[PDB]
Curated annotation (Swiss-Prot):
EC number, as in UniProt: 3.4.23.46
Extracellular side: 1-379
Activity regulation comment: Inhibited by RTN3 and RTN4.
Superkingdom classification of source: Eukaryota
Boundaries of every Peptidase A1 domain copy: 20-349
Protein name: Beta-secretase 1
Residues of the full protein shown: 56 to 446 of 501
N6-acetyllysine modification, residue list: K71, K208, K212, K218, K232, K233, K240
């Protein structure tokens, strides 16, 4: 009910749908930058040269504590890619833990389709494990450095408030950020924050697919990915069920593919015609699962208005993927997500800031009985 972590509350911002970032100050004297909170990768990288989309950048020559690692780094993602030089410097998070650590920093000097115009962030904070760090797992991720050099508990939690702001509690959990109970799912393996989905429902209706399909390849949590990305087959079955569940109004095919937008007169969006979506996650006890349920307010994202007009345009934010399921902002904006690294688990609870209406709310409920959940994972 109280909050010893109060100063970290509301420490995140976003330029409405383009990424949640936190201020991080690197080097000496201080150089503060807006850094994208990303749980889908493991490199701490900051723009280090002028870019059209960058208002400011890291200037290594002005930092007396900067140390060159004399090694380059290249990082390509599903979307965008960048190249930089590796080094280390002192790093603190003003509205984060009260510590300063010497961390690895990749100075971004060149990039393609990575930075986002108007997003207001100039770097990325990869919060995932060393296994997926580039060039290799010997480049210690920022959080690993934090835990090794300080006594900050090995845990962080995220509250991404959609519509843009939120909180990144480092080293603990803050009760004012969620309601109800926290339900935990095992981190299957320490590389990406991999989890296991055992069941999927649309408006309470089971999609009825072997659970292996839901995590075909893998299922991860990535705060730096906009949508709820699903394996091809799952996406197709999900779209058909959602269409059938919202038949009171027809939409062009391109809407479901994210290629077309639909706009309603300001404040008229018929949220009620769209179904809620539930993902069941492996629990912490044998044959026990729990489910998280999002509303259309989460998977139907607002598109930067033409100029504050009377037209609310939306994009269907559930898309397909060829690299497994990716639970992005669409999922996270409905909940307070606890990345309990110490106990190799991720917790979910209803967010105190998720967008909902007077009829429905996002939810986290359990427990449920689910057999053979172990088989759901891809080997
Ligand atoms: C910041 C931005 N991310 C993207 O716009 C993005 C990134 C990646 C992606 O591949 O990201 C990989 C990465 N997250 C791994 O860590 C790195 C990354 C971060 C920022 C920009 C590009 C790539 C995939 C996709 N998709 C293909 S999508 C349309 O969502 O299906 C979108 C974003 C995140 C949270 C929000 F609330 C709104 C906007």
């Amino acid at each position: 009910r109280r909050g010893s972590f109060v100063e970290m509350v509301d420490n995140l911002r976003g330029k409405s749908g383009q990424g949640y970032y936190v201020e991080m100050t690197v080097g000496s004297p201080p150089q503060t930058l807006n850094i994208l909170v990303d749980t889908g990768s493991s490199n701490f990288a900051v723009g280090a040269a002028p870019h059209p989309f960058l208002h400011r950048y890291y200037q290594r020559q002005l930092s007396s504590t900067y140390r060159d690692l004399r090694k380059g780094v290249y990082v390509p993602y599903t979307q965008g890619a960048w190249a930089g030089e590796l080094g280390t410097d002192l790093v603190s998070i003003p509205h984060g833990p009260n510590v300063t650590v010497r961390a690895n920093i990749a100075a971004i000097t060149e990039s393609d389709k990575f930075f986002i115009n108007g997003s207001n962030w100039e770097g990325i904070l990869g919060l995932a494990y060393a296994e997926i760090a580039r060039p290799d797992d010997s480049l210690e991720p920022f959080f690993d450095s934090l835990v090794k050099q300080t006594h900050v508990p090995n845990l962080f939690s995220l509250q991404l408030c959609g519509a843009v702001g939120g909180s990144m509690i480092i080293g603990g959990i803050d009760h004012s950020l969620y309601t109800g109970s926290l339900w935990y799912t095992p981190i299957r393996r320490e590389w990406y924050y991999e989890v296991i989905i055992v069941r999927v429902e649309i408006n309470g209706q089971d999609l009825k697919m072997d659970c292996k399909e839901y995590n075909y390849d893998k299922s991860i949590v990535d705060s730096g990915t906009t949508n709820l990305r699903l394996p091809k087959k799952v996406f197709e079955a999900a779209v058909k069920s959602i269409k059938a569940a919202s038949s009171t109004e027809k939409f062009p095919d391109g809407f479901w593919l994210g290629e077309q937008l639909v706009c309603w007169q300001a404040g008229t969006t018929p949220w009620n015609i769209f179904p809620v979506i539930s993902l069941y996650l492996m629990g912490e006890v044998t044959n026990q699962s729990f489910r998280i349920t999002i509303l259309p307010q989460q998977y139907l994202r607002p598109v930067e208005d033409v100029a504050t007009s009377q037209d609310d345009c939306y994009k269907f934010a559930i898309s397909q993927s060829s690299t497994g399921t990716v639970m992005g902002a669409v999922i996270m904006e409905g909940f307070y997500v606890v990345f309990d690294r110490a106990r190799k688990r991720i917790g979910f609870a209803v967010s105190a800031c998720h967008v909902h209406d007077e009829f429905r709310t996002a939810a986290v409920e359990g427990p449920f009985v689910t057999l053979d959940m172990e088989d759901c994972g891809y080997n």
